[PDB]
Each structure stands twice: as C-alpha cells, then as structure tokens.
Amino acid sequence: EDKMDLYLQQGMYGPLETKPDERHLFLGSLRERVVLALTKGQVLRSKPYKEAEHELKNSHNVTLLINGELQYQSYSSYIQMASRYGVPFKIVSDLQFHTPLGIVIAADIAVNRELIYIQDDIYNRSVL
C-alpha cells in the first residue's frame, strides 16, 4: 500500500499497524527491536557502511539479520564486522514477502529507536 511506501521513503519512523507487518519488513524482527536497517541497494554498495560498523561495535545482545535473497559476496563484509565485535548473524531464508531491506541489526529486547536508517542517495533510489 501507498502508506507503506511513504513509511519507507521517510525512513521507517515509528510502528506499523500490525506485528506481522513489521516482521515481514524487518526480516522477522519487530520494529521496537530494530537498531539499524539497510536497503538491498545500500548493502550492494562496494564500500560497506561505517554506520553499520558503529552499531555492531556499540551493541549489546544484537543479531545481524541478512536477507537471503542477496548473494554472499554482497554481505560478507558485514559478517566480518559482526564477528569482529562478537555479534552473531542469521541468514533469513523463509520470506513470504519481498522486503527491500538487505540487513537488519536487531536487539534481543525493545530499544525503541526513532532513527534506524542511513539517509543517502542510495537509500532514496533503492528503498521503493
């Protein structure tokens, strides 16, 4: 729906209407647990995002969730970053819904973070 497109275009501020909606977008996580999310287009950028490294480095009890639609070479840099800081990863393979998100860093509890995206030209061009 167009309301979802607007939520995405504006950077995914706040909750969605239902819990399943959130899980289907955020690779199985609830919005309240999301620390950072990157679009598939951002994950495909040659240079990995230092902003994701920051969140992995400063994390406590988070997991790196990776969209299984991506090929290994696209996300392997993020796995290196995760392991560097003792963060486990999961490749999410059971997708009912095509999600535009490539990577989600999710906490094991509610963190309620307002800002969970990296605003750049790749985000704007790839999120929809």
From Swiss-Prot:
Task: Specify the domain of life of the species encoding this protein.
Answer: Bacteria
InterPro entries, alphabetized:
DUF1694, Ribosomal_eL30-like_sf
Against SUPFAM superfamilies, the record matches this protein to: YueI-like
* Pfam families, A to Z: DUF1694
What is the name of the protein in this document?
Answer: Uncharacterized protein YueI
